[PDB]
């Protein structure tokens, strides 16, 4: 019962240690530009806002209506929803991620630096995403919570190496990409629910998506400033991450049965148009235009090579990674322990 | 709406940086002695084992029996249970905690060192504690989930400084203490539930308690070996933590209404005999005998002073911190947002 492992060599602290000073200098700047993208706790939605209310007389009927609706939502979509929920639930790993980063790490667990305040508060916001989807999937009766909980335990135990090498450059590019990815992901399931006429479930996915849009805005703004101060290193960091390919946070998924669980879950999300290879290319393309990589000047030869590589990649990937004649048609049906080994098309 | 902050100066990296080598050397030893205290994932219980089963025909009646029982469990006890659950849910902070420690930190998020494997797997085990208590409290109808979720968001945002100063010495003493504390805590609520005749809730707290006992065993064994290799530094580290006083992980608790929420929750736990000042002294006394501090020899003058201080403290605290004539009697009743501002004796 061995979960999959990272296949790449672990590289640590690739950012020159003096460049830490940059992020220490940017402390006040982060307070003024990044922290403002967090919603104050009093103003935030909570999972309870979107679930049957167990302290109301309407509890039983609300749970019943939730379940009646869940019967008309196909297994395909539950697999995706479950995979999205499990990814959210591995949260501890993601706080650890941010806290591996050299200039921005929380050194005590309650550090008053803007970066540490961001990290803690961002985590606190993400925590509600798992909570809400958890209780929704639980109440639905459509999924195998024991197997899902098992997957979650494996996933936190496996952790993840995003290949950011303790560099806030690589790291903040990585989270920029991921935040947009989950925005699209959750946004698509929201839109699809709004179409089976499940408004309450659309509200669940929509509210989570809107959190992710704020996070994306914040992280792209950090990288924006890194392109301002250090155009060379940031382009070289952007390019590095592209060459490696952005590996997803939950790629070591394992449920004790399926040795390729991430690929299989991803295939369903692909087929349903929740999150696709096309989406991957669209995100890279968006970040190129967002950070105005095309518009950068005064770069090193190595920087120019990196700049050119980044701008070329999305149309290249949009091609190279389009020819899914194999994946779309032939695709077999396979059991997912997350739904009691009921089967869905891959 | 400001949550409480840490009142003490943040001190970082007080362990001499060469002493990191000790923990790197102990990698194989940790694999052989510490890692063995983790239960393999297939063998672990999951929250679903202890909750109404939403994929069975018995769901509705199981949820109903849970709620009928919960009506007979007093508000006092729910306040404590809720505070215990919130403490568990702040989990990300505690993984961050372990990953501040100099010789034992996970440098990538998926490091194959024994320490990093411990940290990830321990986290994965703790994650089920919050999950289980969350869904239990949610289904009960007895508590205000929105205000609880709010408190959790503040708590993760606030984080915590356990004053371990990046030292695995201070840190592994700290977790040894906390693990025992939660064992007693969850164990006492188990025992009390077994007495209102709520066997299913007793099972919930009991299974969590039993996890904590394994964690305590593992952490006391690490400190045991630190006393073997470095008797001087370990006694100086033990004494340092005692002088500071062990501050609890959830001490910055805030729900947007009560500026002394931890004190108030703690008072209820004290009054109910769930976790007391006497428990605090008993734990220190246990760890003194467990690590055989009395039996240590060949120490520095500074070491001897620290050794003597540690042995003296528990009887001293058992006295000094017994005279709770004020707390026991006079104690007022106060609202807790966690139970819709219904009131309980402090
Ligand atoms: Fe999220
Ligand atoms: Fe996000
Ligand atoms: Fe726990
Ligand atoms: Fe524990």
PDB file of C-alpha atoms in Angstrom, chain B residues 87 97-98 122 126 160 162 164 168-186 209 212-224 227 237-250 262 266 275-288 290-291 310 313-314 317-318 321:
ATOM      1  CA  UNK B  87      -8.104  23.686  18.864  1.00  0.00           C
ATOM      2  CA  UNK B  97       5.135  24.624  14.361  1.00  0.00           C
ATOM      3  CA  UNK B  98       7.073  21.406  13.806  1.00  0.00           C
ATOM      4  CA  UNK B 122       1.326  13.032  12.450  1.00  0.00           C
ATOM      5  CA  UNK B 126      -4.508  14.899  13.653  1.00  0.00           C
ATOM      6  CA  UNK B 160       0.657  30.751  17.748  1.00  0.00           C
ATOM      7  CA  UNK B 162       4.845  28.307  21.558  1.00  0.00           C
ATOM      8  CA  UNK B 164      10.222  26.973  21.162  1.00  0.00           C
ATOM      9  CA  UNK B 168      13.777  20.825  18.504  1.00  0.00           C
ATOM     10  CA  UNK B 169      14.788  20.515  22.181  1.00  0.00           C
ATOM     11  CA  UNK B 170      12.264  23.104  23.315  1.00  0.00           C
ATOM     12  CA  UNK B 171       9.815  21.996  20.614  1.00  0.00           C
ATOM     13  CA  UNK B 172       9.782  18.265  21.355  1.00  0.00           C
ATOM     14  CA  UNK B 173       9.390  19.030  25.063  1.00  0.00           C
ATOM     15  CA  UNK B 174       6.515  21.345  24.118  1.00  0.00           C
ATOM     16  CA  UNK B 175       4.688  18.731  21.990  1.00  0.00           C
ATOM     17  CA  UNK B 176       5.325  16.058  24.647  1.00  0.00           C
ATOM     18  CA  UNK B 177       3.474  18.255  27.105  1.00  0.00           C
ATOM     19  CA  UNK B 178       0.670  19.145  24.640  1.00  0.00           C
ATOM     20  CA  UNK B 179       0.125  15.557  23.516  1.00  0.00           C
ATOM     21  CA  UNK B 180      -0.369  14.437  27.095  1.00  0.00           C
ATOM     22  CA  UNK B 181      -2.601  17.461  27.700  1.00  0.00           C
ATOM     23  CA  UNK B 182      -4.953  16.560  24.858  1.00  0.00           C
ATOM     24  CA  UNK B 183      -4.909  12.884  25.921  1.00  0.00           C
ATOM     25  CA  UNK B 184      -6.203  13.845  29.384  1.00  0.00           C
ATOM     26  CA  UNK B 185      -8.540  16.430  27.824  1.00  0.00           C
ATOM     27  CA  UNK B 186     -10.164  14.092  25.274  1.00  0.00           C
ATOM     28  CA  UNK B 209      -7.495  10.289  22.966  1.00  0.00           C
ATOM     29  CA  UNK B 212      -2.807  11.344  21.368  1.00  0.00           C
ATOM     30  CA  UNK B 213      -1.336   8.679  23.664  1.00  0.00           C
ATOM     31  CA  UNK B 214       0.700   7.316  20.751  1.00  0.00           C
ATOM     32  CA  UNK B 215       1.892  10.837  19.892  1.00  0.00           C
ATOM     33  CA  UNK B 216       2.938  11.481  23.505  1.00  0.00           C
ATOM     34  CA  UNK B 217       4.823   8.168  23.572  1.00  0.00           C
ATOM     35  CA  UNK B 218       6.733   9.166  20.423  1.00  0.00           C
ATOM     36  CA  UNK B 219       7.669  12.661  21.595  1.00  0.00           C
ATOM     37  CA  UNK B 220       8.727  11.624  25.091  1.00  0.00           C
ATOM     38  CA  UNK B 221      10.986   9.044  23.427  1.00  0.00           C
ATOM     39  CA  UNK B 222      12.702  11.770  21.369  1.00  0.00           C
ATOM     40  CA  UNK B 223      13.329  13.853  24.479  1.00  0.00           C
ATOM     41  CA  UNK B 224      14.431  10.661  26.243  1.00  0.00           C
ATOM     42  CA  UNK B 227      18.621  13.443  27.616  1.00  0.00           C
ATOM     43  CA  UNK B 237      15.633  23.316  27.601  1.00  0.00           C
ATOM     44  CA  UNK B 238      13.132  21.635  29.950  1.00  0.00           C
ATOM     45  CA  UNK B 239      13.686  24.330  32.594  1.00  0.00           C
ATOM     46  CA  UNK B 240      13.456  27.146  30.040  1.00  0.00           C
ATOM     47  CA  UNK B 241       9.993  25.945  28.961  1.00  0.00           C
ATOM     48  CA  UNK B 242       8.781  25.699  32.580  1.00  0.00           C
ATOM     49  CA  UNK B 243       9.906  29.232  33.482  1.00  0.00           C
ATOM     50  CA  UNK B 244       8.152  30.646  30.420  1.00  0.00           C
ATOM     51  CA  UNK B 245       5.098  28.528  31.317  1.00  0.00           C
ATOM     52  CA  UNK B 246       3.672  26.248  28.633  1.00  0.00           C
ATOM     53  CA  UNK B 247       1.286  28.439  26.638  1.00  0.00           C
ATOM     54  CA  UNK B 248      -1.543  26.527  24.981  1.00  0.00           C
ATOM     55  CA  UNK B 249      -1.894  26.303  21.173  1.00  0.00           C
ATOM     56  CA  UNK B 250      -5.330  27.916  21.105  1.00  0.00           C
ATOM     57  CA  UNK B 262      -9.430  31.182  25.919  1.00  0.00           C
ATOM     58  CA  UNK B 266     -10.494  27.093  30.000  1.00  0.00           C
ATOM     59  CA  UNK B 275      -8.629  19.925  32.006  1.00  0.00           C
ATOM     60  CA  UNK B 276      -7.420  21.686  35.141  1.00  0.00           C
ATOM     61  CA  UNK B 277      -4.489  23.518  36.744  1.00  0.00           C
ATOM     62  CA  UNK B 278      -3.959  20.290  38.722  1.00  0.00           C
ATOM     63  CA  UNK B 279      -3.654  18.457  35.361  1.00  0.00           C
ATOM     64  CA  UNK B 280      -0.980  20.966  34.312  1.00  0.00           C
ATOM     65  CA  UNK B 281       1.100  20.100  37.405  1.00  0.00           C
ATOM     66  CA  UNK B 282       0.466  16.358  36.996  1.00  0.00           C
ATOM     67  CA  UNK B 283       1.826  16.446  33.450  1.00  0.00           C
ATOM     68  CA  UNK B 284       5.022  18.243  34.466  1.00  0.00           C
ATOM     69  CA  UNK B 285       5.434  15.793  37.369  1.00  0.00           C
ATOM     70  CA  UNK B 286       4.902  12.878  34.965  1.00  0.00           C
ATOM     71  CA  UNK B 287       7.515  14.149  32.491  1.00  0.00           C
ATOM     72  CA  UNK B 288      10.051  14.646  35.337  1.00  0.00           C
ATOM     73  CA  UNK B 290       9.379   9.823  32.680  1.00  0.00           C
ATOM     74  CA  UNK B 291      12.659  11.452  31.646  1.00  0.00           C
ATOM     75  CA  UNK B 310      12.450  21.382  37.356  1.00  0.00           C
ATOM     76  CA  UNK B 313       8.248  23.101  40.308  1.00  0.00           C
ATOM     77  CA  UNK B 314       5.293  20.609  40.192  1.00  0.00           C
ATOM     78  CA  UNK B 317       2.633  24.719  41.318  1.00  0.00           C
ATOM     79  CA  UNK B 318       0.357  22.106  42.916  1.00  0.00           C
ATOM     80  CA  UNK B 321      -1.865  27.230  41.781  1.00  0.00           C
TER      81      UNK B 321
END
